[PDB]
């Protein structure tokens, strides 16, 4: 299991916006977290949240299976990091 | 945990080859597996193995932490799927 931590300082999201190729508006919410990838300290990682989802609260989380998909070259890829409480 | 299965029919790798941009030869070994992504049946996924590593034997496996890296846009990515026995 991948250990992900949302620190007290990471409790908010920021929002970027713009317009798609054929006219539609979009908004993307982004939140930071720390993921332990087995180095000396956890590393900082940016997450784009799904529509209508609040920022995750501070605490410990692991990665949900829906984070993954098979890509166009047939290998596994991350679609978007989606989290569940530890 | 991601459940990965190497079936009896997937016990071998195939090898692709070629030459890099500035002259070096390369060989890449590829092996297939089934990964349970929570749909009605597991899906077929292609893996590129690391240098000097044999094909994984038939059986159940989970994903090692070294499979992941932070990408150039700061989000988590899969580098190469690396497995350990379940």
Encoded tokens for A19: 């317009």
Q: Which domain holds residue B62?
A: 1-86
Which of A70, A76, A81 to mutate: most B Cβ within 10 Å? A76
At which residue do the structure tokens 């193995």 appear?
B49
Count of structural domains within chain B: 1
CA distance A65 to A16: 26
Instruction: Say which of B1, B43, B70 has its CB closest to residue A70.
Output: B43
Q: B47 with B30: CB under 8 angstroms?
A: yes
CA distance B20 to B64: 28
First vs last C-alpha separation in chain B: 10
- A74–B78 C-beta distance less than 8 A: no
User: Within 10 A of A82 (CB to CB), how many other CB atoms are there?
Assistant: 17
- The residue of chain A nearest to residue B67, with distances taken between CA atoms, is A37
- B81–A78 C-beta distance less than 8 A: no
Nearest-5° Cα angle at A52, A48 to A55? 55
Q: For this experimental structure, what is the resolution in angstroms?
A: 1.8
CATH number at residue B66: 2.40.50.140
* A43 contact residues in B (CB cutoff 8 A): 70
Solving technique: X-ray
Nearest Cα neighbor of B30 from B45, B40, B8, B19 is: B45
Strand partners, A82: none
């Amino acid at each position: 299991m991948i250990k992900v931590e949302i620190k007290p300082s990471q409790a908010q999201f920021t929002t970027r916006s713009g317009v798609s190729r054929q006219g539609k508006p979009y908004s993307l919410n982004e939140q930071l977290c720390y993921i332990d990838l087995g180095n000396e300290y956890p590393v900082l990682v940016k997450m784009t949240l799904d529509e209508g989802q609040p920022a995750y609260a501070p605490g410990l989380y692991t990665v949900h299976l829906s984070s993954f998909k098979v890509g166009q070259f047939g290998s596994l890829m991350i679609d978007r990091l989606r989290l569940v409480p530890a």
